[PDB]
Design an enzyme around this catalytic site. Sequence first.
Site, PDB file in Angstrom:
ATOM      1  N   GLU A 146       0.824  -1.199   0.000  1.00 37.47           N
ATOM      2  CA  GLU A 146       0.000   0.000   0.000  1.00 37.47           C
ATOM      3  C   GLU A 146       0.865   1.259   0.000  1.00 37.47           C
ATOM      4  OE1 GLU A 146      -1.882   1.563   3.585  1.00 37.47           O
ATOM      5  OE2 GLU A 146      -1.546  -0.369   4.616  1.00 37.47           O
TER       6      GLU A 146
ATOM      7  N   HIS B 245     -10.785   4.675   3.659  1.00 38.99           N
ATOM      8  CA  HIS B 245      -9.967   4.058   4.705  1.00 38.99           C
ATOM      9  C   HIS B 245     -10.201   2.548   4.762  1.00 38.99           C
ATOM     10  CE1 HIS B 245      -8.019   4.503   8.941  1.00 38.99           C
ATOM     11  NE2 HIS B 245      -7.100   4.608   7.995  1.00 38.99           N
TER      12      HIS B 245
END
Lengths: 90, 108
Positions: free
Chosen positions: B71, B100
Site C-alpha cells: 500500500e 480508509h
Amino acid sequence: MKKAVINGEQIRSISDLHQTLKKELALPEYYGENLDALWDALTGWVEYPLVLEWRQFEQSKQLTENGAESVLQVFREAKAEGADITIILS
Amino acid sequence: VINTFDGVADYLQTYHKLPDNYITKSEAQALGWVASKGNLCDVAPGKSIGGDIFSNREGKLPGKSGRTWREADINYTCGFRNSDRILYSSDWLIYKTTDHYQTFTKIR
C-alpha cells in the site's frame, strides 16, 4: 502516554467496538472501522506510548460474533512488530 | 511529486516500483516521524508514506497463490494522514480506496 479503556461488557457489536476504539484512541473522523483501518491507525496515526486496558474481554467476544479476537490480534501484531503497546486483559 | 491515483498507478505499471517520493512507515519513523504529531513534511519534505506490506485483513482484495499486497498513501501533501490509498499486488493488480479500506475499486 495515552490510555484507551474498553468495558467489554458494554460492547454492543463489532461495529460498536470499532466506534469505541475510535473515541478511546482519538482516531480520525474517516476511520474505516475495519481491521485494515485499525492496523493503519495503530501504525501511522495513534499517539505513542500506548496502553490498552480491555476489561471483561470474554463478554466482548460474545457480544461481537467473535470479532473481538481479531481486533485484539491487530494490537498484538502491531506490538509484535515493534509498536510500543501495553495490553491489559483484566 | 507523483501521488495521484492515476499518477502512481501509471508509474507502478511502468517501473514496477513506487515513485521516489514514497518511504515506508519504518523509514519515516527513523527520520523522526511522529505520526500523532503529523510532522512528516518537517522531517521528510515532500515524502508520502508508502511501500509497506498490506495484509488485506478483511480479505476484500482477491487472493491468489504467491500473491502479496502493498500500500501507499494517495493525495497526501502535509500534516495528518488522509483516507486515500493505492493497493498493488506482487503481480501488479492495482486497486484504490478512498474510505480508509472499507471498499476497494480496481484501477489496473
